[PDB]
Tab-separated table of C-alpha atoms and ligand atoms in Angstrom:
chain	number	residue	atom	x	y	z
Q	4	UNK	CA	-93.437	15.968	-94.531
Q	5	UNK	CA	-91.010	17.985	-91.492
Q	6	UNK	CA	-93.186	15.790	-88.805
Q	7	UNK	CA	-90.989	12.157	-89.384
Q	8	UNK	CA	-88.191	14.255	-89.343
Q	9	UNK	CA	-88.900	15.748	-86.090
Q	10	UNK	CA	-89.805	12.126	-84.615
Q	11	UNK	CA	-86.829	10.401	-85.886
Q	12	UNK	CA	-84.236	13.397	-84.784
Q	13	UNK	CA	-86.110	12.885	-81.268
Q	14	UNK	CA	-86.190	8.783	-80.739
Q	15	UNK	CA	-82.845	8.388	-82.587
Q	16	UNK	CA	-81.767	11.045	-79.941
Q	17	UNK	CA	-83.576	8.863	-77.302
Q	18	UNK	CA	-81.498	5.787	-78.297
Q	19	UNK	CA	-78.247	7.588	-78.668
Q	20	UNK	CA	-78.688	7.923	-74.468
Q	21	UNK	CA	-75.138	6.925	-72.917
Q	22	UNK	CA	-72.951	6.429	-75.976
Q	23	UNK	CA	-72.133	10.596	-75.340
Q	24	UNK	CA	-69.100	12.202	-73.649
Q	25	UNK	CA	-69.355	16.436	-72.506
Q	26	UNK	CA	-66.799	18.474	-71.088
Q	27	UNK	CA	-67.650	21.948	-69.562
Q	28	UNK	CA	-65.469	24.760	-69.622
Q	29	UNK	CA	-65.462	27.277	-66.485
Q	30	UNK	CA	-63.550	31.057	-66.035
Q	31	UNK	CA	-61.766	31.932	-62.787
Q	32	UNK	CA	-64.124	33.971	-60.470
Q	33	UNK	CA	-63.552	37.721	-59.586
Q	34	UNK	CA	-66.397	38.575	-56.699
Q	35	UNK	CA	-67.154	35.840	-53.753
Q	36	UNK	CA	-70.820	35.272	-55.054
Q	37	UNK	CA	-69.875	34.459	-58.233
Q	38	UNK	CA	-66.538	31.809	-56.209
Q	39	UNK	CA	-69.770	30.254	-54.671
Q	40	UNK	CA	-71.907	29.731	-58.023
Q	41	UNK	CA	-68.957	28.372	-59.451
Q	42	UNK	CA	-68.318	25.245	-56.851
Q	43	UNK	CA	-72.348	24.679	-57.146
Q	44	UNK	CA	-72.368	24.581	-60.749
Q	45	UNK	CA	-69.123	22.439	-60.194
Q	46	UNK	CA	-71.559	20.022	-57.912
Q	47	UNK	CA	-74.315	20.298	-60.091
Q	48	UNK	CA	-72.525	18.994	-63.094
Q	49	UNK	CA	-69.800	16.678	-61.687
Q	50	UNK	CA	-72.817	14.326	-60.921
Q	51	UNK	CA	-73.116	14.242	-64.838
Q	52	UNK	CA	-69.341	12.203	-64.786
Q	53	UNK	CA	-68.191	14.747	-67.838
Q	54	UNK	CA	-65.434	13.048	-69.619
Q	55	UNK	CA	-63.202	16.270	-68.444
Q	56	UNK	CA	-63.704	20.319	-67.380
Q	57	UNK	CA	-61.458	22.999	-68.478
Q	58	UNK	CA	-60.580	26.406	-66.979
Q	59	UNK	CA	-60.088	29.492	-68.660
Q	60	UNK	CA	-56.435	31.469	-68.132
Q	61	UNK	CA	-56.699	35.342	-69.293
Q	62	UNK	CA	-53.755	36.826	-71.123
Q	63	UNK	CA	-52.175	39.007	-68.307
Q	64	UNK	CA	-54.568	38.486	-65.821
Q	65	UNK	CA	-51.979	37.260	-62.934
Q	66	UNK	CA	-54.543	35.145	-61.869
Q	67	UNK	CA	-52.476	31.700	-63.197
Q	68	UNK	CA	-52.445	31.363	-59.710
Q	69	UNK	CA	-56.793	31.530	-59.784
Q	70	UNK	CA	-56.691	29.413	-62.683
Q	71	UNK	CA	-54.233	26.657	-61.036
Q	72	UNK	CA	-56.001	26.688	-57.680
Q	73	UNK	CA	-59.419	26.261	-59.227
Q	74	UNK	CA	-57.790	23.088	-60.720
Q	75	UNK	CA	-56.554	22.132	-57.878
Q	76	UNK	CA	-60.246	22.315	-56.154
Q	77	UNK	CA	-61.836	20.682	-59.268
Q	78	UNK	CA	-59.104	17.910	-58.811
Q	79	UNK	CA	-59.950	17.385	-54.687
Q	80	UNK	CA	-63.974	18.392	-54.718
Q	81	UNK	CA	-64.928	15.621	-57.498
Q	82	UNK	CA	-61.815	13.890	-58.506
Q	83	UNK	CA	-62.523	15.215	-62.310
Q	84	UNK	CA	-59.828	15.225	-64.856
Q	85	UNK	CA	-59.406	19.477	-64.561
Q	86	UNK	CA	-57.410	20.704	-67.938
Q	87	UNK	CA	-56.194	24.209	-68.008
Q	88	UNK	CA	-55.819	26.699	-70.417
Q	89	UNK	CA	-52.045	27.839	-70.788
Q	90	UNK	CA	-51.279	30.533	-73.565
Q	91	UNK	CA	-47.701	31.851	-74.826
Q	92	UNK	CA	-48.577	35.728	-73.371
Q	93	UNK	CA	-46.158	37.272	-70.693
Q	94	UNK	CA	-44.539	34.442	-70.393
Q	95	UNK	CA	-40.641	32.686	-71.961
Q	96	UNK	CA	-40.485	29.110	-73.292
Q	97	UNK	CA	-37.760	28.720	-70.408
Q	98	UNK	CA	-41.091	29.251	-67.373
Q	99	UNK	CA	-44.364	27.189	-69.079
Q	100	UNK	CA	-41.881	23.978	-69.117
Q	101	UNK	CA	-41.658	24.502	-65.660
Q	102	UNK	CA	-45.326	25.267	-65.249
Q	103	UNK	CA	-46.054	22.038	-67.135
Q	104	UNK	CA	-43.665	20.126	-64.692
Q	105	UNK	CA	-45.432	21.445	-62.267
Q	106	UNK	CA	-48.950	20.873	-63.934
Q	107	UNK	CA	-48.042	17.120	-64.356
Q	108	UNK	CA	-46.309	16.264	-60.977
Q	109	UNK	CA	-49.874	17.618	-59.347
Q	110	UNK	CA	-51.636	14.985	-61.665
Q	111	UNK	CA	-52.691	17.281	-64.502
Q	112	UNK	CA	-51.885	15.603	-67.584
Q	113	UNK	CA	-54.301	16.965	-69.611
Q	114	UNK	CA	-53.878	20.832	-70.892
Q	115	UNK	CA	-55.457	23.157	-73.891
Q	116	UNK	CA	-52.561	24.712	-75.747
Q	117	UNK	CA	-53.745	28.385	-76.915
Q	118	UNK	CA	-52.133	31.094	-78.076
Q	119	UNK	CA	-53.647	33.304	-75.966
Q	120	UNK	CA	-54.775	37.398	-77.291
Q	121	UNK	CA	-52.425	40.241	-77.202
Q	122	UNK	CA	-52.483	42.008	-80.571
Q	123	UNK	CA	-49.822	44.911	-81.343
Q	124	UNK	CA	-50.392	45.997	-77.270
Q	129	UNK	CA	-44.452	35.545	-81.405
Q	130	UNK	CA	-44.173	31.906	-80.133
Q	131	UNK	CA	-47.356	30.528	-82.217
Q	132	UNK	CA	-49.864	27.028	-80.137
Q	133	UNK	CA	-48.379	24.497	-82.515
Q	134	UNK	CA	-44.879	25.550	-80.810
Q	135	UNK	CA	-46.632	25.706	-77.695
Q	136	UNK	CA	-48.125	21.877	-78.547
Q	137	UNK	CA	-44.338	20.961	-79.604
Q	138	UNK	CA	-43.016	22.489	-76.008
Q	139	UNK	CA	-45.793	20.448	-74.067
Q	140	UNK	CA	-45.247	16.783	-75.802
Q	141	UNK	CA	-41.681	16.761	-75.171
Q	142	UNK	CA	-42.099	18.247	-71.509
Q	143	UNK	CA	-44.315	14.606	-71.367
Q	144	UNK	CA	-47.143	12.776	-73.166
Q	145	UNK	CA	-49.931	15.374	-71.992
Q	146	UNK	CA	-53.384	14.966	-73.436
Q	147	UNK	CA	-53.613	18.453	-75.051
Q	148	UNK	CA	-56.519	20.120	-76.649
Q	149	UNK	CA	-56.008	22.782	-79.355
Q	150	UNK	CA	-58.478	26.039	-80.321
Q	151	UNK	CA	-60.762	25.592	-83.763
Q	152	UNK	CA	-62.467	28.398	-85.775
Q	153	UNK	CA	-64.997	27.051	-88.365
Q	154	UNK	CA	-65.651	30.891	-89.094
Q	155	UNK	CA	-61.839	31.588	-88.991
Q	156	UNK	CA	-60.109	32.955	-86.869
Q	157	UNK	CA	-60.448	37.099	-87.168
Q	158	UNK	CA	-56.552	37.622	-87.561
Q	159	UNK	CA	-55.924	34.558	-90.241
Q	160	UNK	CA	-54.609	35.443	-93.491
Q	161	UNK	CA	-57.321	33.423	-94.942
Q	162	UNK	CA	-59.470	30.487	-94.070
Q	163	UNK	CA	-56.947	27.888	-95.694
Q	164	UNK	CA	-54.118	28.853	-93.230
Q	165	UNK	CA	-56.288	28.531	-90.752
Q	166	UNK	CA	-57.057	25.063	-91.566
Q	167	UNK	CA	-53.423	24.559	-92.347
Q	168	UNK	CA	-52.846	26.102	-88.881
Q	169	UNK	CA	-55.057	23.558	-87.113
Q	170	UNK	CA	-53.681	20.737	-89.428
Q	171	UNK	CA	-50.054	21.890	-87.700
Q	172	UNK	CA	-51.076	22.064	-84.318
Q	173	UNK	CA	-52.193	18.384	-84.573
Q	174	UNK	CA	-49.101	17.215	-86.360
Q	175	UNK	CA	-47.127	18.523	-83.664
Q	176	UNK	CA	-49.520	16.336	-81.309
Q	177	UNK	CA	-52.614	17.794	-80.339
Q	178	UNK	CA	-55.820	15.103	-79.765
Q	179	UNK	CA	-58.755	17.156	-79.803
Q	180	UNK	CA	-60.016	20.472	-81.457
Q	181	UNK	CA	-62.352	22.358	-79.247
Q	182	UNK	CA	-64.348	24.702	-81.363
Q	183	UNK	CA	-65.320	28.516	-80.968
Q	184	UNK	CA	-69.011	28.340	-80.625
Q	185	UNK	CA	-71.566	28.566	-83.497
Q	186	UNK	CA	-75.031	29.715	-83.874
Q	187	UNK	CA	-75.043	28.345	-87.732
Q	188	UNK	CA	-74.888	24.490	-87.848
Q	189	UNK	CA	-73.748	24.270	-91.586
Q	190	UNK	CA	-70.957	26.069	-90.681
Q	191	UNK	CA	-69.183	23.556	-88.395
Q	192	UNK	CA	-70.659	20.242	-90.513
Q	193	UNK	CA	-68.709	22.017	-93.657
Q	194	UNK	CA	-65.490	22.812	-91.307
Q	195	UNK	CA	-65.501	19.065	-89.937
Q	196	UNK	CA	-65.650	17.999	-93.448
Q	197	UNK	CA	-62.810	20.389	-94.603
Q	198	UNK	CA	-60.290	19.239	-91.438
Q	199	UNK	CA	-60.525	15.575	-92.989
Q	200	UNK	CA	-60.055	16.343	-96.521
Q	201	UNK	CA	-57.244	18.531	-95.464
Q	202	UNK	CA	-56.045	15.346	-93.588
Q	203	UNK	CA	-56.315	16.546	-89.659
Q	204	UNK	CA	-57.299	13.086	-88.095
Q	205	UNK	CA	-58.438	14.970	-84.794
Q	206	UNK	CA	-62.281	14.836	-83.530
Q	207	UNK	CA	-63.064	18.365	-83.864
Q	208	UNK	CA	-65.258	18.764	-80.560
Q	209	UNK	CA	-68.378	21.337	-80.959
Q	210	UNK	CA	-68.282	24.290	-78.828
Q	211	UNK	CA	-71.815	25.278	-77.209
Q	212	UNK	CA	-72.759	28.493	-75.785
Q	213	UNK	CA	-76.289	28.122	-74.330
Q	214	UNK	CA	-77.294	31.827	-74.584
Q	215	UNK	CA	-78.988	33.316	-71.721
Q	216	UNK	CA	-77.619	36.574	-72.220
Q	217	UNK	CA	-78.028	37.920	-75.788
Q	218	UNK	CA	-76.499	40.929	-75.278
Q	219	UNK	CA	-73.063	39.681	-73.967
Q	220	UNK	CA	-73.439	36.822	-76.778
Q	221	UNK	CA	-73.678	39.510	-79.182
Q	222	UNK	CA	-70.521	40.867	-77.568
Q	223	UNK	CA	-68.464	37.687	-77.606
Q	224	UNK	CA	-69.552	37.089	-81.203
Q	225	UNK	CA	-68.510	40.347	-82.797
Q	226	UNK	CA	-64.957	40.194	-80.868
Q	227	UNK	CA	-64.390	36.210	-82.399
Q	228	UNK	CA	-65.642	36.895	-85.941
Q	229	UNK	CA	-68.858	34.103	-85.301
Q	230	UNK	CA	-71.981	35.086	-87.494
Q	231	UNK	CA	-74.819	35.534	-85.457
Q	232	UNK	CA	-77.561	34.410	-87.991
Q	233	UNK	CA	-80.438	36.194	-89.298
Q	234	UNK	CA	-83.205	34.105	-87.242
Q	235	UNK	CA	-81.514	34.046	-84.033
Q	236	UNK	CA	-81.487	38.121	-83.879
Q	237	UNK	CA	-85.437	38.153	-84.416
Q	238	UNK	CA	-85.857	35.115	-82.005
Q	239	UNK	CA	-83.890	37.473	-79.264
Q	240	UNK	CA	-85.464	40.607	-80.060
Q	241	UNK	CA	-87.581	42.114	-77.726
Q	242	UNK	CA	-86.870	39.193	-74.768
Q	243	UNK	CA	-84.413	42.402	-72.959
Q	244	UNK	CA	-85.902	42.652	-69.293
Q	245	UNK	CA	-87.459	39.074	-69.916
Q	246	UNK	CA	-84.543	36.598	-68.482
Q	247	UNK	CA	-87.056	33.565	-67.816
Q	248	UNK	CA	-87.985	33.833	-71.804
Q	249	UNK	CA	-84.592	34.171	-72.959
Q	250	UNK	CA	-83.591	31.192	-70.704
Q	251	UNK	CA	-86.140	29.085	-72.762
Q	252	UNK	CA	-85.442	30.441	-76.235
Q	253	UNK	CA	-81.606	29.683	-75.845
Q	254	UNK	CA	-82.310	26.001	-74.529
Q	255	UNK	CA	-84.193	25.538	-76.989
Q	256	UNK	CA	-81.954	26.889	-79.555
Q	257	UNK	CA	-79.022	24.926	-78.014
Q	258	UNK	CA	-81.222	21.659	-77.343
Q	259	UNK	CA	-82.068	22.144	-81.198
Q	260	UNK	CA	-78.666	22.160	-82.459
Q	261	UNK	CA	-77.186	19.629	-80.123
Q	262	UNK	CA	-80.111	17.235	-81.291
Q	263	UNK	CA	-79.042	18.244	-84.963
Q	264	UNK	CA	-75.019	17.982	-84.102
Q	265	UNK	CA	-75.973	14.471	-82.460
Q	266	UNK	CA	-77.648	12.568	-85.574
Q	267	UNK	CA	-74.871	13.762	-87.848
Q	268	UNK	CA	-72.167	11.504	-85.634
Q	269	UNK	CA	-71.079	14.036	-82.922
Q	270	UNK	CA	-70.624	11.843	-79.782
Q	271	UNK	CA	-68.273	14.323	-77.643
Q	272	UNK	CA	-69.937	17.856	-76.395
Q	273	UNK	CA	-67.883	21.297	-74.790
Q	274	UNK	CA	-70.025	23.282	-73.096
Q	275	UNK	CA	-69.182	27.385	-72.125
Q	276	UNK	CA	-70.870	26.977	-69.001
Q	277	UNK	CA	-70.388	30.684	-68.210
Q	278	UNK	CA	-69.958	29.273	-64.576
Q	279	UNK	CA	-73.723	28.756	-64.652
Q	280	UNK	CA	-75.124	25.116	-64.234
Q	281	UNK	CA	-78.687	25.091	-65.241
Q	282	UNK	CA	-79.212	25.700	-69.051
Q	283	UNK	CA	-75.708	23.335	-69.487
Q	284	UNK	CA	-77.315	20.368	-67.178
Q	285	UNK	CA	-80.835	20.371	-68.805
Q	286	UNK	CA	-79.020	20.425	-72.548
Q	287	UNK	CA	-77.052	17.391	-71.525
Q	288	UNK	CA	-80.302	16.025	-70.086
Q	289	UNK	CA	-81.714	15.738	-73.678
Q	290	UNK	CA	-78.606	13.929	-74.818
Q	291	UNK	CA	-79.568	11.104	-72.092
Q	292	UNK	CA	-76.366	12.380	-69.844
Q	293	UNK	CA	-78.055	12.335	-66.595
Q	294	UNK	CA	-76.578	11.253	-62.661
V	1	FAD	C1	-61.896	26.278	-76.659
V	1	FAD	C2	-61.314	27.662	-76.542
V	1	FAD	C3	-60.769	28.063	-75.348
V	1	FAD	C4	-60.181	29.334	-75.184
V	1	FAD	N1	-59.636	29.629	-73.959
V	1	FAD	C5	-59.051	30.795	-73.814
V	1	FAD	C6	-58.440	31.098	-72.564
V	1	FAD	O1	-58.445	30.316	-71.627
V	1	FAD	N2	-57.793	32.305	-72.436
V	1	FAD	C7	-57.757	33.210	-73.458
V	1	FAD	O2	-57.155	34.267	-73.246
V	1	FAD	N3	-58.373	32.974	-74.658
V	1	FAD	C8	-58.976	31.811	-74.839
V	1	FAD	N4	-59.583	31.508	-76.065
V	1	FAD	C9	-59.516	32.506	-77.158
V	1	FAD	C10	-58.242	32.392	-78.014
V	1	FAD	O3	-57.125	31.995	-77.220
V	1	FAD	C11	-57.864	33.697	-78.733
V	1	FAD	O4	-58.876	34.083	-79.669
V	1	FAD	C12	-56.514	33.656	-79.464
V	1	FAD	O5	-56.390	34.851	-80.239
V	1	FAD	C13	-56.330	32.465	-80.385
V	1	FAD	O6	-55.410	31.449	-79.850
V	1	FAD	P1	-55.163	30.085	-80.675
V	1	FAD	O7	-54.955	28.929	-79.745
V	1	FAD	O8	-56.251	30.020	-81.689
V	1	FAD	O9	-53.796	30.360	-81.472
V	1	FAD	P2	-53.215	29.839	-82.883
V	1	FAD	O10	-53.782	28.483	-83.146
V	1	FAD	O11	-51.722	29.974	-82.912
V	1	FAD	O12	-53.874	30.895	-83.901
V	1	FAD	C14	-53.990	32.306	-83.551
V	1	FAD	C15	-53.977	33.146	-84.807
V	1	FAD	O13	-52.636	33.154	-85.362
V	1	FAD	C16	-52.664	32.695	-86.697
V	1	FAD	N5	-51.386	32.010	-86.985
V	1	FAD	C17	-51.063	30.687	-86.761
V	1	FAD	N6	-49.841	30.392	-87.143
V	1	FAD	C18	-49.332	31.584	-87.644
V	1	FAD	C19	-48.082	31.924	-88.202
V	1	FAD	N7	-47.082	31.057	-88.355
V	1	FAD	N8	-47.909	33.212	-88.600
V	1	FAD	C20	-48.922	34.077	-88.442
V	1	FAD	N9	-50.136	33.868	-87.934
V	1	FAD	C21	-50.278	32.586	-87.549
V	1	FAD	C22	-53.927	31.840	-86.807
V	1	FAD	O14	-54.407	31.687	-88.128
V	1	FAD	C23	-54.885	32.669	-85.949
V	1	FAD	O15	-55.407	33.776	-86.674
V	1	FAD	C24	-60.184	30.251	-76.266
V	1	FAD	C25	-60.781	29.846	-77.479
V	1	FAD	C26	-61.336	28.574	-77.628
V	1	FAD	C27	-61.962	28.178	-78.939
C-alpha cells in the first residue's frame, strides 16, 4: 500500500540527481568562533557549486559593513555569486542607490529586496524592487509567506503584495520556511492563479535546535505542526538525536517538495554546514 510509494519517492529522487539548483543563506558573525565556522561551512558547501548564497543584513545593526565584507570574502574565497540582503530601515532612497552602485561596480548583481522589520519603534520592497531595476538590471530576489506574513491585512494582499513586487521586476520568491508541506504546494498554486509568473523557491530550515525554531516560528507567524512538537519532545540535552530527527524531517520534505516539480532549494544554513550538505546529498548535489 505506503511501501511503492516510499520506493518510487526514493528512485524517482535517485534519478532526479543533477537536474537541482540550492542556494544557502548565511548571517553576519558576532564572536570569532562563530567568523571561523562560517568560512568552513562556506568551504564545506562551495564544493556543492550552489547556484548562489545570500547574506543576511539586520535592521539597524550597523553591521552593512559585516554584511558587505562577508560578500566581498564569499566573492574572493570561492568565486560564488554572493547576493545580499538590503532592506528600506535607517536608510533614504537618495543612499541604497548609491549602495547599489556600489554593490554592482564590485560585481554584485544579484540582491534580495526586503523590507526589512521595524514596527511602530514607509518605503514598502516593491518600491525598493522599482529603485533597484532602474539603478541596473540586478537579479533580485523578493521575501514569500505561504502562512502570511504576521502584519498583512489578510492573506490576499499578501499575495497581491508578492504579485507587485514581481511586476515591478523581481525573479525569484524565496520563501519563509515551513514545517507543513501542504501549505507551500497550496501557496505555489495560489501565486499562479493570481498570475505571479515567479518560481517561488522553498525555504528550508533543517532544525537542530528546536527551541530557537520554536522561537523563529512564533515571531514569523509559521505553524509548527502537531507531529513535529511530539517528534521534538523530550530530545532537550540530546543534540546528536535532534540532529537526526531534523534531517530526517528536512530530507523527508525535500524528497516530498522534489517529486512535486521543485528543482531550485534555499537553505537557512544557520552558518552551520553539516545537516545543509547531507540534505543536498539526498537530492544527488554532491562535489
Ligand atoms: C528569504 C528571506 C530573507 C530574509 N532576510 C532578512 C534579512 O536579511 N534581514 C532582516 O532584517 N529580515 C529578513 N527577513 C525577514 C523579513 O525581512 C521581515 O519579516 C520583514 O518584516 C518583511 O519584509 P518583506 O520583504 O516581506 O516586505 P514586504 O514585501 O513589503 O511586506 C512586509 C509587510 O508589509 C505588508 N505590505 C506590503 N505592501 C503594503 C502596503 N502598501 N501597505 C501596507 N502594508 C503593506 C505586507 O503584506 C507584509 O505584511 C527575511 C525573510 C525571508 C523570507
Amino acid at each position: 500500500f505506503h511501501a511503492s510509494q516510499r520506493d518510487a519517492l526514493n528512485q524517482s529522487l535517485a534519478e532526479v540527481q543533477g537536474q537541482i539548483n540550492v542556494s544557502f543563506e548565511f548571517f553576519p558573525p558576532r564572536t570569532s568562533e562563530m567568523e571561523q565556522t562560517l568560512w568552513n561551512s562556506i568551504d564545506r558547501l562551495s564544493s556543492l557549486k550552489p547556484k548562489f548564497v545570500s547574506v543576511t543584513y539586520g535592521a539597524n545593526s550597523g553591521e552593512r559593513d559585516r554584511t558587505h565584507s562577508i560578500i566581498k570574502g564569499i566573492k574572493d574565497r570561492t568565486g560564488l555569486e554572493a547576493a545580499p540582503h538590503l532592506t528600506c530601515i535607517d536608510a533614504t532612497p537618495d543612499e541604497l542607490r548609491t549602495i547599489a552602485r556600489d554593490y554592482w561596480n564590485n560585481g554584485i548583481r544579484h540582491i534580495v529586496a526586503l523590507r526589512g522589520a521595524l514596527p511602530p519603534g514607509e518605503m514598502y520592497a516593491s518600491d525598493l524592487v522599482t529603485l533597484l531595476k532602474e539603478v541596473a538590471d540586478f537579479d533580485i530576489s523578493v521575501a514569500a509567506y505561504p502562512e502570511v506574513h504576521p502584519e498583512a491585512k489578510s492573506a490576499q494582499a499578501d499575495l497581491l503584495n508578492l504579485k507587485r513586487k514581481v511586476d515591478a521586476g523581481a525573479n525569484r520568491a524565496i520563501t519563509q520556511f515551513f514545517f507543513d508541506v501542504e501549505s507551500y504546494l497550496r501557496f505555489r498554486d495560489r501565486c499562479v492563479s493570481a498570475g505571479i509568473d515567479v518560481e517561488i523557491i522553498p525555504g528550508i530550515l533543517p532544525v537542530s535546535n528546536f527551541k530557537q525554531a520554536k522561537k523563529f516560528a512564533d515571531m514569523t507567524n509559521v505553524r509548527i505542526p502537531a507531529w513535529m512538537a511530539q517528534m521534538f519532545d523530550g530530545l532537550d540535552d540530546d543534540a546528536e538525536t535532534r540532529k537526526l530527527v531534523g534531517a530526517n524531517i528536512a530530507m523527508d520534505m525535500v524528497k516530498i517538495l522534489s517529486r512535486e516539480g521543485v528543482k531550485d532549494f534555499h537553505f537557512y544554513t544557520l552558518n552551520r554546514a553539516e545537516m545543509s550538505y547531507a540534505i543536498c546529498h539526498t537530492l544527488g548535489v554532491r562535489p
